[PDB]
């Protein structure tokens, strides 16, 4: 069961000690990172939580994934420190997580600064699988790191349009769009009106997705009644986020200069994706 | 529920108005067209039904797919007119049909002669997806069109050999054959005898499929008792028809100069495939 | 039902007559042969059983698959004779075995020395599928054939380390390993100790699989208490054996000069894989 944040580490050379009984979340998160073509993952460990940061290849999307120490089975970190992980190196490791593993344990030791330990346990046969992954002390992408500030509950006022999609709905919408376009217009008139997602390709195909019941997608709008909100957004990274099916239910927030924020939470994991322009 | 053919269109500029609560049939039919490497689909709309015509790439197979107006939820057409659809343009649209869509609506308007409208509805969340597809007024392949006459119930006398396969059986037989050959011999002696499907590849492999019980595959024969019926037929297009699993139960008819007709019906859709030589 | 070995063949020109009601075993065995990149299969028929021999492409692994006549539905062979089968020729035939076939029959006739007959029966519709496969009188790989002697119950004394994996466990272990390495160290200290599977790749990743409960994997050891057993083995062929999921439960035996033997039995089939170095 879940004991949360510990005052002292079970092992003594431990700078980080983490244990969690849903290792499948790491698999799906790293499938997301693969889909974004992230080459290197930035990791911040603090005494209260571990955060994974990355950009997509186009550098336009920012991903921040937080795992809350108080909501995992065991958590200890001595202080604030950073690690760099080559994503390709760990891809197959995280993809190897399946139903046979009921625990993931992560350890980082003072006396082995370039190693990160991942331990998977199969309890049916007392099998323990230990990975020693070479990691580095990373140069910090400060723009990426500070994007976290730009996703506080308080900072989300200038987001006049927001709604929720299930994983299935998000995947469907952006798969359907991606079939024919890289760009989509999001439009909504002020007031009690439908949400429009649409595009036009001259002399071939135009497509229009209209959501007639705001209530059914939990849409909230503060668009002034007489105004039209209309932004044009890129959808590549959204397909990635969708397919990765990491969550359950995804909150989507739009801002008038075209930034799009996707948020989902599921137990200990909080996933944020911010895409600009 | 199903209201069939209407006297007047709900919308007024409508030359065609079509609605149907099993949109999955369009998906499977267009998977068939893709498998046949059809580049362009010919469409005839009349006040009683809509028919889709195509040839396969080899031009040897003729496909005629009819959707009966009286058996759909809503149908209206002003007169007889023709439309041409680029198959590749609409491929992803039709492939996007899934369980979330409970209705497909098709509209063609007088004042927009180069547009065909496809509307899909998700009733769980009041989501409406509207495609505007560029279409053309087609030059008519008259040989293709008149192949329809060559599939009337009356015209099927000179077919002395016929039987039925389930979708599963058809797929199995022509997948098994396609593994090793492009051509198969169909042979049946007059009288109460087994059906043979077979081929020979010198110094590698010969294969023989024998159906010992005519009753179990609903075989009917008018081959004179003392005669042998034997034709050699190409099977590529048949694999396509099979894999597309559009139907349930497929009637197969053979003629002595080697033409092969496949027919299946399921609610509003009637699918005919004629292959020559 | 199972009548076992017959004194006389139903047909009279038969040198071999074989029938069996689990044809799926042939499919999975030939998937194994495909995974090993076996080009030619050696077949020994005797009056008591039929044996399939092959090497993998690297020639380091030896596969011996025996089907016991007394445990099949019908078996007859006149004497000891050998056949050679091109694996690629028969690949699609064996892959075509599915749920619709409840019987496989194999026949070899005196008067047709270069033909091997495979007959599959679908009893739902009285359909009989007969393959005539060109085969040859093979030059004998005597090293391969005599590897059978090196797998007698008696010869397995100098195997001080052995345990059992389910199909799922074997696939998991060698898929996990194959992600990152071609070679693995198997290590076990004498006495009541854990089994180690591990490797090291400098400056990227090391991996260690430890089995803490010998009982749970049915491990038996005769390693002297004060000694360490340690061998380095190649794993490619093991992935093949695993994925082919031919069995249920697989016995693994290790010898101090690095040979690894895998054995599984399921009804009439006994499968042995010996890999050297």
Given a contact cutoff of 8 angstroms between Cβ atoms, the answer to whether C118 and C130 are in contact is yes
B22 and B143 within one domain: yes
Any long-range contacts for A68-73 (C-beta under 8 Å, 24+ apart)?
Answer: A68/A268, A68/A270, A69/A4, A69/A5, A69/A18, A70/A4, A70/A5, A71/A2, A71/A4, A71/A267, A71/A268, A72/A2, A72/A4, A72/A18, A72/A19, A72/A20, A72/A268, A73/A1, A73/A2, A73/A3, A73/A19, A73/A20, A73/A21, A73/A103
B242 and B162 within one domain: yes
Question: Which among A215, A161, A218, A164 is positioned nearest to A189, based on CA atoms?
Answer: A161
Given a contact cutoff of 8 angstroms between Cβ atoms, the answer to whether C37 and C239 are in contact is no
DSSP character at residue C5 = B
Task: Output the domain CATH number for residue A177.
Answer: 3.10.150.10
Is residue A141 situated within a structural domain? yes
By Cβ distance, the residue of C169, C179, C213 closest to A92 is C179
Is residue C7 situated within a structural domain? no
Q: What is the DSSP string of C88-113?
A: HHHHHHHHT--TT--EEEEEEETT-T
Find the residue in B nearest to A195 (Cα).
B127
How close does chain C come to A98, measured CA to CA in Å?
9
Is residue C5 situated within a structural domain? no
The structure tokens listed for A27 are 């698999």
d(CA A78, CA A111): 14
Indicate the burial class of B3 (C-beta count within 10 angstroms; 0-12, 13-18, 19 or more). exposed
Asked if the Cβ–Cβ distance from B204 to C134 is below 8 Å, we say yes
Domain end, chosen from C115, C130, C147, is at C147
Q: Which site among B84, B126, B130, B134 would you substitute to test the A interface, given the most A Cβ atoms closer than 10 Å to its Cβ?
A: B126
b/e map A21-59, b = 16+ CB within 10 Å: bbbebbbbbbbbbbbbebebbbbbbeeebbbbbbbbeee
Question: Between residues 84 and 123 of chain B, which touch chain A (CB distance below 8 Å)?
Answer: 89, 92-93, 95-96, 98, 100
Half-sphere exposure for B218 (CA within 13 Å, toward CB): 10
Is residue A264 situated within a structural domain? no
DSSP character at residue C141 = -
Residue with token string 């390495």: C181
Domain end, chosen from B147, B181, B198, is at B147
Domain end, chosen from B84, B116, B147, is at B147
d(CA C173, CA A129): 10
C193 and C140 within one domain: no
d(CA C57, CA C162): 26
Nearest-5° Cα angle at A180, A177 to A181: 70
A141 and A180 within one domain: no
A175 and A80 within one domain: no
Give the strand order in the sheet containing B161-166. Answer: B81-86, B40-45, B49-55, B61-68, B269-275, B260-266, B249-254, B161-166, B220-221
Question: Which among B239, B268, B270, B269 is positioned nearest to B61, based on CA atoms?
Answer: B239
Task: Please list the residues that pair with A73 across neighbouring strands.
Answer: none
What is the 3-state secondary structure of chain A? CCCCECCCCCCCCEEEEEEECCCHHHHHHHHHHHHCCCCEEEEEECCCEEEEEEECCCCCEEEEEEEEHHHCCEEEECCCEEEEEEHHHHHHHHHCCCCCCCEEEEEEECCCCCEEEEEEEECCCCEEEEEEEECECCCCCHHHHHCCHHHCCCCCCCCCEEEEEEHHHHHHHHHHHHCCCCEEEEEEECCCCCEEEEEEECCCEEEEEEECCHHHHCCEECCCCCCEEEEEEECHHHHHHHHCCCCCEEEEEECCCCCEEEEEEECCEEEEEEECC
Is residue A249 situated within a structural domain? yes
Q: What is the DSSP string of B158-188?
A: S--EEEEEEHHHHHHHHHHHHTT-SEEEEEE
Domain that holds residue B61: 14-147
Find the residue in A nearest to B87 (Cα).
A204
Indicate the burial class of B111 (C-beta count within 10 angstroms; 0-12, 13-18, 19 or more). exposed
Is residue B6 situated within a structural domain? no
Is residue A262 situated within a structural domain? no
* Stated resolution in angstroms: 1.8
Residue with token string 């002697």: C149
Given a contact cutoff of 8 angstroms between Cβ atoms, the answer to whether B263 and B247 are in contact is no
B162 and B137 within one domain: no
Find the residue in C nearest to A87 (Cα).
C204
Is residue C9 situated within a structural domain? no
C187 and C256 within one domain: yes
Instruction: Enumerate residues 6+ apart whose C-beta is below 8 A from C45.
Output: C15, C16, C77, C80, C81, C82, C83, C108
A105 and A21 within one domain: yes
C224 and C143 within one domain: no
Asked if the Cβ–Cβ distance from A176 to B129 is below 8 Å, we say yes
What φ, ψ does residue A144 adopt, rounded to 5°? -60, -50
Given a contact cutoff of 8 angstroms between Cβ atoms, the answer to whether C50 and C65 are in contact is no
Asked if the Cβ–Cβ distance from C129 to B176 is below 8 Å, we say yes
A175 and A139 within one domain: no
| C211 reaches A (C-beta below 8 A) | yes
- Residues of chain C with C-beta less than 8 angstroms from the C-beta of A100: 168, 172
Q: What was the experiment behind these coordinates?
A: X-ray
C158 and C127 within one domain: no
By Cβ distance, the residue of C93, C100, C128 closest to B210 is C128
Number of compact structural domains in chain C: 2
A141 and A177 within one domain: no
Nearest-5° Cα angle at A176, A175 to A179: 85
d(CA A167, CA A174): 11
Instruction: Enumerate residues 6+ apart whose C-beta is below 8 A from B95.
Output: A179, B27, B30, B31
Helix, strand, coil shares, percent, chain B, to 5: 20, 45, 35
Find the residue in B nearest to A215 (Cα).
B125
Query: Which chains border C (3 or more CB–CB pairs < 8 Å)?
Result: A, B
Strands B161-166 and B127-134 come out as unpaired
Nearest-5° Cα angle at C262, C258 to C267: 165
Any long-range contacts for C217-221 (C-beta under 8 Å, 24+ apart)?
Answer: C217/A125, C217/C163, C217/C164, C217/C165, C217/C169, C218/C163, C218/C164, C219/C161, C219/C162, C219/C163, C219/C195, C220/C161, C220/C162, C220/C163, C221/C160, C221/C161, C221/C162, C221/C188, C221/C190, C221/C191
Strands A269-275 and A61-68 come out as antiparallel
Which of helix, strand or coil describes residue C245? coil
């Amino acid at each position: 069961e879940r004991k949360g944040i510990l005052e002292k580490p079970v092992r003594p050379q431990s700078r980080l000690e983490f244990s969690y009984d849903n290792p499948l979340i790491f698999k799906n998160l790293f499938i997301y990172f693969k889909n974004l073509k992230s080459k290197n993952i930035l990791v911040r460990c603090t005494p209260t939580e571990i955060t994974f940061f990355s950009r997509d290849q186009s550098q336009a999307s920012f991903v921040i994934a937080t795992i809350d120490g108080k909501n995992v089975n065991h958590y200890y970190a001595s202080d604030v420190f950073w690690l760099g992980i080559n994503r390709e190196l760990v891809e197959k490791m995280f993809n190897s997580i399946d139903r046979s593993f009921l625990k993931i344990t992560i350890v980082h030791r003072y006396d082995k600064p370039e190693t990160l330990f991942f331990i998977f346990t199969d309890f049916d046969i007392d099998k323990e699988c230990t990975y020693q992954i070479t990691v580095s002390e990373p140069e910090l992408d400060m723009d990426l790191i500070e994007m976290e500030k730009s996703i506080s509950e308080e900072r989300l006022k200038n987001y006049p349009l927001r709604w929720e999609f299930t994983s299935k709905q998000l995947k469907k919408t952006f798969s359907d769009l991606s079939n024919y376009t890289e760009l989509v217009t999001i439009e909504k008139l002020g007031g009690d009106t439908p949400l429009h997602l649409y595009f036009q390709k001259f002399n071939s195909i135009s497509y229009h997705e209209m959501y007639k019941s705001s209530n059914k997608i939990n849409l909230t709008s503060t668009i002034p009644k007489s105004q039209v909100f209309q932004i044009n957004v890129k959808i590549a990274h959204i397909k990635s986020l969708a397919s990765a099916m990491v969550t359950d239910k995804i909150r989507i927030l739009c801002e008038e200069n075209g930034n799009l924020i996707f948020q989902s939470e599921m137990d200990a994991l909080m996933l944020n994706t911010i895409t600009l322009n």
